[PDB]
RNA sequence: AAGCGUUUACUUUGAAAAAAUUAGAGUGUUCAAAGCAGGCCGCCUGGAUACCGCAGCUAGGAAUAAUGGAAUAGGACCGCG
RNA sequence: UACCUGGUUGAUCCUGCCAGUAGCAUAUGCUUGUCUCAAAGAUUAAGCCAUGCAUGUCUAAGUACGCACGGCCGGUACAGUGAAACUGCGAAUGGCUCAUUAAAUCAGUUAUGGUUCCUUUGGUCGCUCGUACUUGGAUAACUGUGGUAAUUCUAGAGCUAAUACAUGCCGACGGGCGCUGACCCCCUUCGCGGGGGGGAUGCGUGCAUUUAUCAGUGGUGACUCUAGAUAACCUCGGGCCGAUCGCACGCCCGGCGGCGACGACCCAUUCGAACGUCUGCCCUAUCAACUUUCGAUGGUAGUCGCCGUGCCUACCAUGGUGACCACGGGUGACGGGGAAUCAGGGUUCGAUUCCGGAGAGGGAGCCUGAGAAACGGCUACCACAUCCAAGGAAGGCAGCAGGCG
C-alpha cells in the first residue's frame, strides 16, 4: 500500500507510538491568502517537501505558470511564456524560461494546460527553488 | 645540521615542524617548513657532542667540578620562594625576597630586588571583593528589576480582567437585544 | 579533500560549466566519519566561524527514548542490524542517522519494577536471589498500595513488546548525529513503527 | 578580497555626508556599532567638517583623548564611531548640547539644546523576542536590549528612555493620527503626520503621511519615525521645521535675507 | 475600519533604483575651466533639483489585443428527506 | 543646428561606393613664451626581474633580577624610563592587473522561516547544591659551547615570570520544589474498603547542546518560532561562573566598599560572506538533435558542510533540453554605473581611480588565524631562477620607483 521507501514513512511532527486503550495529522497554513486543500489534510501520504505538509517555507516571491510535462515521480515541468520589449526594433519577442516545480501528490487530476501559481522557497535539489501551490483547472474541458 | 628527537635515522633528513616542537623556531604564527636534520643516532659523521654528565666521578676534572657557576636568577613567583626558603602561608614573603648586588665603575653599589608576582596585596583583596560586589549588586539590581516589573504585570492583570469583564458583560448585552 | 560545489558539474541541459575561480576555504569537505564501536574515543575539528564539531570514530554511549512513556537512558550499544541507507553498513559495523540496531533491555527493565513494580517477561523457574528488587517489589504501606494498584490497571502492555523483552534485546534507532555532535541518541522502536522493520529484515535475509 | 572592508574612498561614500574630492582620497570609515554604515555619522567628521572647531584630523583624535567629548553617558574614545540616529554628543564644560536629527534636507544640522531635553531620549523598538526565562525584550533601532518593559509598546511602536539608568520612562503608540518623518531617501526631511496606514500582504507595508499643509504622501513602513503624539512632538526641530518647499521657492526667500541685509 | 474578485498585455501614480559622471540653483579661484564658497559687524546660509534604463511590488480603468463559462446538460438559485 | 561637394559621359538624370567633412583616442614629425589642472607599460610580453622599500604595534591598566639609564629613604618586592624577549590584535587591509570567465561574473527586486560572524554597542555573567589571603611546574632574554662555505638555520648545561600552559575553590549556600516516600493524624463504613492533610533519607533542580512528549507568556502572512515542565546526555583531541593587572582612597570594631583596562558562556547590533528567485549578454547551422550508469533528470535513506541541495554515496523512474536556437565552438568578452558622436531612432567603446568577481608564473594541497585554499604565508611538481667550499641553502615587482626584452 504506502510507505514503500526504504525507512519508515511518518510526519516528523505526529507520534502514535503512544499507549492506545486514525492516525494523526500535522499541516500548516501557507499565508498570502492561499487556502489548505482537503486531501492534503484527509489524505494518509507524507512529503518532506510539500508547502503544507512537509518542513519547507514558500517565501520571496510568488509566481505562475503552466503544466506541460508530467513524466517524472511527484514533480512536473511548468512553462513561463513572458515577453520582452526591446528598445531598438520596438516590438516584442517571445521567451519562455520552463523549469521544473515540485507538485505534491495533495493534488490528484492534474492535466495539460492547467495554469498553477508557484512559490519559491529553500532549494529542494539542483534546480528546483519552488513547489506547487494550488492548482487551477483548464480553459474549460471537464470531461 | 642540528640532530633530531625520535626520527630514527642516521643520514640526513628534511623534516616540517611546528609550534610546540623543538628544533625549529615559528616565525609566522604556526608556519610549517621542512628542515635539514641528523638522524638521532651518534656516528662517526659528526662534529660536536653534546653530553650531560649526571653521575660524578670518582676523580676531580678541572673543569666542572672545580669551579661551580653560581645561580643567575632566583625564584620569582612567591610559591617557589615558598618551595625553596620552606616557608608557610602565614609568614611574609618581602623580607626572603632574593636579591642581587649591583656594582661597577663611575657609580655607586647598588641593590636590585625583583617585582613579586601573585603575592597577597591588599590591592587584588581590593579587587577580590569588588568582584563579589557586583555578584551582590547584580543579584540585587535584577530582584528589584523583576520587582518593578512584576508590580507592573500586576498592573495590566488586574485591566485586562477587567477588559475581559467589560467584554463579557458587552456579550451579555447583545444577547437580550 | 571532497569539494561542496554546485558550480563543478553540467547545468540543467547536458553543458558543462567554465568555472572562474578555485576552489575555496568556504568549499571545504573533510572525510567520512565511518564510527565503529569500541572504547569512547572523540576527534575534534575546526569548523567555519571558529566552533567545534565532535567526529565519532569508537563509541558505546547513546541515550535512546522510550515513547509511551518519555524516559531515556544513556544505555549500551553493541551492534548494528538493518540501516536504511547502505546494504554494506548493514554488514559494517557502523553508527550514522536513522540507523534500526539491536540494544539491551535492562537499564529500562530496572525502572519498570522500580516505579510501577510490575512483572514483564521474567520465565518462571528463576528467581532473583540477591532479593535487591523483590524489596522494590514488596513492603507497601496502606496509601502508597492504592498508587501501585492505580498502576497495576495503567500499565496494560502492548503485546508485540513482550516479546521483544523475553530475549533482552530491543530495536533503536538512531535519530541524532555522531559524526557532528559526537552523540549517537535516538528513540527506540516501539509499536507499529517496530512492526514495520520486523518485516523488512527477513525481507533482506529470506 | 579575503574579508571584510575597513577602508573607505572619499567618493565612495554616499551622498548625506557632502564629502569633498579635493582634500583626500580616502574617507574615515566607521567602524562596527549600533547604527548603520551609510545611515550614521562618525565624531571625525561630526566635528572637523560641521562644527569647524579642527581644522586636520589629528586633531580629533588629540580631543578625545582629552576627555571632553562623551556620547549619552559614556565618553568613546573612538573618533569614528558610526553615530546614526539621536545621539547627544555632550560637551563637558561648556554645556552646548547637540542631538543628531535630519535637516529638511538629506543632510544633518547642527541644533543646540538645553540640558534638560539631553536627559532622555526616544527610542523605537524593532522587534519583540522572548528570553530565555520568558523575558520580554525589547531592541531598539540602535539595540539597547532593555528588558522587562511595558508590554504595550508592540512592533513597530516607540520608548522614551533614562540614560543615567540605561531604562525606559514613557512610551508612544502607533496609532492612526500621529506625527512622522521619514528616515531616508529622497524625501528626507519631512515632518508631517500620519492620515492611514495600509498594510499589504506579504510585501512591504505602506503608511501614507500627510503635511501640514495638505501635502499627502507615501512612505514604507520600515522608512518612518514617529516623532511625537497627535500634532505635539517630543523632541525638538530645527529652522526649516521639515517642510520641503519647492526649489522655486527656495530662491524667493534667498533672496529675500540679501536684498534686506544687503 | 478588516477581508474576498476569471486571468493577462496596456496606461497613470508611489517607494526603491549606491556616489562621481548627464542637465542644472548659488559663488569673481581677477573671466574661465575646476571647485564647494563667502559677506558682515558670532551670524546668515548652502552643498538642491531633474534622469535613473529592463524585470519585480503597489494602488484607479476595462476601450483596445486574446481566453472561456451551460447544449450527450453531472448547467446555475432558494431550499428539503 | 534634422546640412554637404568632386569623381564613370561628346554633353545630362539616377543607383552606387570612393574621395573629400567634423569630433572622438594613440603614436610620430616640426615648432613652443607665460600660466591653472593634467592622462600616462595594457594593447605585441598576465614576459622576466638586478637594486632599495611597502605591517607592524606598549598604555596608568599582561609580564622589568639588561644599572642601558636612573631616586637614596632602604632591607616592606618592584621610584620612573627602560634595550631585548614571552603574550594579545593586525598582516585575509591596501595597491596592481583583467590572464580566466558568455545566465557564469556582473546589474536591478528579493529571502537565510535554510548559517556563521574578529572587533564595537545594549543585556545575563552568587540562578547549578558539590590552598582559595591565590595551586602546579616548564621556557624565552641573560651566562656559556659552538656547528656551517652559505640562511630571519639550530642545540646541549643554569634558571626565572605569566591575561602563554594545566588544576581548581572560599561566598552565593538556607533551603524553595518533583520523585522514590518509610510513617504519623482525621472522618465514615460491622469491617475490608473510600477520602483528605503533614513528612524522615537520597537523587535531581543555571546557562548552551542532544533524544523524546504534554499543554499552549509573547509575535510573524504562515514554525518543526521563542518560551514552561516532564525523562535522561554534557565529549578529557573539554564551555562560563574573573587563581589577571593599574590608579586615586574611604566605613566599622579583622569585616565591608570605588574608577577602569583586558578577555570571556550566551542572545541581539554592525561590516559582511555564501547560498537562493525573476529579468537582462557578442557572433556562429560550413554546430540539429544534445546530455545520461564517468549524477545527466527527480524521489527514498544517509555522509560532509556554517547549514538546504547528486555537493557526495546505494537503490528506484529514464528521463531533462531544443526550430520561443538546445548542445558545441570562437569572443583583440571581467561586467555594470557609464564615455564619445549625435534631430530623433541608435552606433562604437567601456582593463583604467566607483562598485562587485578573479589572480599574483601554472594548477594541486594546507597550518595558524573569526576571516586564506593567502602567496611582500607555507608543501610538492613543472617552466624559470640565486649563492656554493659541491656538503647544502634560498626566490616569486600582472605592487612602489627602477632595469632588460
Redesign the interface.
Known amino acids: 500500500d504506502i510507505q514503500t521507501e526504504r525507512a519508515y514513512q511518518k510526519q516528523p511532527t505526529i507520534f502514535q507510538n503512544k499507549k492506545r486503550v486514525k492516525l494523526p495529522r500535522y499541516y500548516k497554513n501557507i499565508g498570502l491568502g492561499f487556502k489548505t486543500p482537503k486531501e492534503a489534510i484527509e489524505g494518509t501520504y507524507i512529503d518532506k517537501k510539500c508547502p503544507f505538509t512537509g518542513n519547507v517555507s514558500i517565501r520571496g516571491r510568488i509566481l505562475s505558470g503552466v503544466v506541460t510535462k508530467m513524466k517524472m515521480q511527484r514533480t512536473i515541468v511548468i512553462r513561463r511564456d513572458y515577453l520582452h520589449y526591446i528598445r531598438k526594433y520596438n516590438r516584442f519577442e517571445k521567451r519562455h524560461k520552463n523549469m521544473s516545480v515540485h507538485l505534491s501528490p495533495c493534488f490528484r487530476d492534474v492535466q495539460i494546460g492547467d495554469i498553477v501559481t508557484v512559490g519559491e522557497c529553500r532549494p529542494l535539489s539542483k534546480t528546483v527553488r519552488f513547489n506547487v501551490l494550488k492548482v487551477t483547472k483548464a480553459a474549460g474541458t471537464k470531461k | 645540521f642540528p640532530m633530531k628527537q625520535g626520527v630514527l635515522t642516521h643520514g640526513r633528513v628534511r623534516l616540517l615542524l611546528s609550534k610546540g616542537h623543538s628544533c625549529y623556531r615559528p616565525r609566522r604564527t604556526g608556519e610549517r617548513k621542512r628542515k635539514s636534520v641528523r638522524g638521532c643516532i651518534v656516528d662517526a659523521n659528526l662534529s660536536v657532542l653534546n653530553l650531560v654528565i649526571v653521575k660524578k666521578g670518582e676523580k676531580d676534572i678541572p673543569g666542572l667540578t672545580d669551579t661551580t657557576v653560581p645561580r643567575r636568577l632566583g625564584p620569582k613567583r612567591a610559591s617557589r620562594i615558598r618551595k625553596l626558603f620552606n616557608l608557610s602561608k602565614e609568614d611574609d614573603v618581602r623580607q626572603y625576597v632574593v636579591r642581587k648586588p649591583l656594582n661597577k665603575e663611575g657609580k655607586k653599589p647598588r641593590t636590585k630586588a625583583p617585582k613579586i608576582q601573585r603575592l597577597v596585596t591588599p590591592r587584588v583583596l581590593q579587587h577580590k571583593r569588588r568582584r563579589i560586589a557586583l555578584k551582590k549588586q547584580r543579584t540585587k539590581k535584577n530582584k528589584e528589576e523583576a520587582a518593578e516589573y512584576a508590580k507592573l504585570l500586576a498592573k495590566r492583570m488586574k485591566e485586562a480582567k477587567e477588559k475581559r469583564q467589560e467584554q463579557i458583560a458587552k456579550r451579555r448585552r447583545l444577547s437580550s437585544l | 579533500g571532497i569539494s561542496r560545489d ?1 558550480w563543478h558539474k553540467r547545468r ?1 541541459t547536458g553543458g558543462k560549466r567554465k568555472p572562474y575561480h578555485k576552489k575555496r576555504k568556504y568549499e571545504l569537505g573533510r572525510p567520512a566519519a565511518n564510527t565503529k564501536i569500541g572504547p569512547r574515543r572523540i576527534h575534534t575539528v575546526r569548523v567555519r566561524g571558529g566552533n567545534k564539531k565532535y567526529r565519532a570514530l569508537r563509541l558505546d554511549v547513546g541515550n535512546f527514548s522510550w ?3 518519555c524516559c531515556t537512558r544513556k544505555t549500551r550499544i553493541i551492534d548494528v542490524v538493518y540501516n ?2 547502505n546494504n554494506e553498513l548493514v554488514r559494517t559495523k557502523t553508527l550514522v542517522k ?1 540507523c534500526i540496531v539491536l540494544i539491551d533491555s535492562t537499564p529500562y527493565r530496572q525502572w519498570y519494577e522500580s516505579h510501577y513494580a510490575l512483572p514483564l517477561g521474567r520465565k518462571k523457574g528463576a528467581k532473583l536471589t540477591p532479593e535487591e528488587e523483590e524489596i522494590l517489589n514488596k513492603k507497601r504501606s496502606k496509601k502508597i498500595q492504592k498508587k501501585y494498584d492505580e498502576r497495576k490497571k495503567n500499565a ?1 502492555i ?1 503485546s508485540l513488546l513482550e516479546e521483544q523483552f523475553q530475549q533482552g534485546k530491543l530495536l533503536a534507532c538512531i535519530a541524532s548525529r555522531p559524526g557532528q555532535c559526537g552523540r549517537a541518541d535516538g528513540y527506540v522502536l ?4 517496530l512492526e ?2 520486523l518485516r523488512k529484515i527477513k525481507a533482506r535475509k529470506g | 578580497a579575503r574579508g571584510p572592508k575597513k577602508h573607505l574612498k572619499r567618493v565612495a561614500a554616499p551622498k548625506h555626508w557632502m564629502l569633498d574630492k579635493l582634500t583626500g582620497v580616502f574617507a574615515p570609515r566607521p567602524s562596527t556599532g549600533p547604527h548603520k554604515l551609510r545611515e550614521c555619522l562618525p565624531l571625525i567628521i561630526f566635528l572637523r567638517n560641521r562644527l569647524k572647531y579642527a581644522l586636520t584630523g589629528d586633531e580629533v583624535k588629540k580631543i578625545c583623548m582629552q576627555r571632553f567629548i562623551k556620547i549619552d553617558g559614556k565618553v568613546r574614545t573612538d573618533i569614528t564611531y558610526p553615530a546614526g540616529f539621536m545621539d547627544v554628543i555632550s560637551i563637558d564644560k561648556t554645556g552646548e548640547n547637540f542631538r543628531l536629527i535630519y535637516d529638511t534636507k538629506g543632510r544633518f544640522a547642527v541644533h543646540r539644546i538645553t540640558p534638560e531635553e539631553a536627559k532622555y531620549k526616544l527610542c523605537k523598538v524593532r522587534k519583540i523576542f522572548v528570553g530565555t526565562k520568558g523575558i520580554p525584550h525589547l531592541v531598539t533601532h540602535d539595540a539597547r536590549t532593555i528588558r522587562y518593559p511595558d508590554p504595550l509598546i508592540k512592533v513597530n511602536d516607540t520608548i522614551q528612555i533614562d540614560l543615567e539608568t540605561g531604562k525606559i520612562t514613557d512610551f508612544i503608540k502607533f496609532d492612526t493620527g500621529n506625527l512622522c518623518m521619514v528616515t531616508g531617501g529622497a524625501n528626507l526631511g519631512r515632518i508631517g503626520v500620519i492620515t492611514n496606514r495600509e498594510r499589504h500582504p506579504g510585501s512591504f507595508d505602506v503608511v501614507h503621511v500627510k503635511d501640514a499643509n495638505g501635502n499627502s504622501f507615501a512612505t514604507r513602513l520600515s522608512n518612518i519615525f514617529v516623532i511625537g503624539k497627535g500634532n505635539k512632538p517630543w523632541i525638538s526641530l530645527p529652522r526649516g521645521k521639515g517642510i520641503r518647499l519647492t526649489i522655486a521657492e527656495e530662491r524667493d526667500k534667498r533672496l529675500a535675507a540679501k536684498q534686506s541685509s544687503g
Open positions: 554546485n540543467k515513547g509511551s512513556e536504511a541507507s536513522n496494560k502492548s516501539e509499536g507499529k513503527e514495520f522493520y
